[PDB]
């Protein structure tokens, strides 16, 4: 990382520049920009979407896509510096 | 440990019954040692016999 709620290999929409309608994976900000399952934040919060919407991001923080649809997660943006460049607004 | 163990012993200490049990276990250790000498098997039996012979001599 440059700074998994849903089932494994779930159909996750690549919100990043990959733009895949449903890419195999998931939790929002976990990479995975969004997911059907709620991402239980350590601060007691959740983060999810209607279905799995995990963007493409490498484990080292170098996200494959730099066009994250909507605002990327702030935890994801902090964990993945390219995800921060993918979407200026960090959720 | 060390300084911490000494400070704990001075402040709290240790169970006195454990020391009495340890002395009781020491007598059991001699009985266990005789049982162990009669329970060692295979290569351990030869090693135990060699250790016992060396200790006796």
């Amino acid at each position: 990382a440059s700074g998994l709620g849903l089932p494994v290999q779930a159909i996750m929409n690549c919100a990043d520049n990959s733009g895949a309608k449903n890419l195999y994976i998931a939790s929002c900000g976990d990479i995975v920009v969004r997911q059907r399952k709620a991402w239980r934040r350590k601060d007691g919060v959740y983060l999810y979407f209607e279905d799995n919407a995990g963007v493409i991001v490498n484990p080292k923080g170098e996200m494959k896509g730099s066009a994250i649809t909507g605002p990327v997660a702030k935890e994801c943006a902090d964990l993945w510096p390219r995800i921060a460049s993918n979407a200026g607004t960090v959720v | 440990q060390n300084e911490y163990i000494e400070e704990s012993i001075r402040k709290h200490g240790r169970r006195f019954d454990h020391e009495e049990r340890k002395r009781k276990k020491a007598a059991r250790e001699a009985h266990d040692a005789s049982l162990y000498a009669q329970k060692t098997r295979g290569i351990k039996a030869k090693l135990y016999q060699e250790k016992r012979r060396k200790e006796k001599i």
Binding site: - | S8, R15, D17, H18
Partner: protein
């Protein structure tokens, strides 16, 4: 550090130990028949068990001591526990 809470049920037949070094699981020990366990008010955190069977009382004390056993902890450093203090004839 963490005080141990002792609860008596069925006229001392069942003894429940809670908050043992921060443990969140309560340990329940059932005394042998013919032995009654009560908390003496003369000495704080003192439990007195009286019965007609010496073997049953000794077995109950051993079970209580075995229940309150420190696991994966230093005996010299962590001295918290429950042990038999004194034993003798009631009369």
């Amino acid at each position: 550090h963490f005080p141990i809470n002792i609860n008596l049920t069925e006229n001392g037949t069942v003894v429940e130990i809670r908050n043992f070094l921060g443990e969140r699981i309560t340990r329940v020990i059932k005394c042998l028949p013919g032995v009654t366990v009560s908390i003496s008010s003369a000495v704080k955190d003192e439990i007195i068990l009286e019965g007609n069977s010496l073997e049953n009382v000794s077995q109950s004390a051993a079970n209580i001591k075995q229940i309150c056993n420190v696991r994966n902890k230093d005996i010299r450093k962590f001295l918290d526990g429950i042990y038999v203090s004194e034993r003798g004839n009631i009369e």
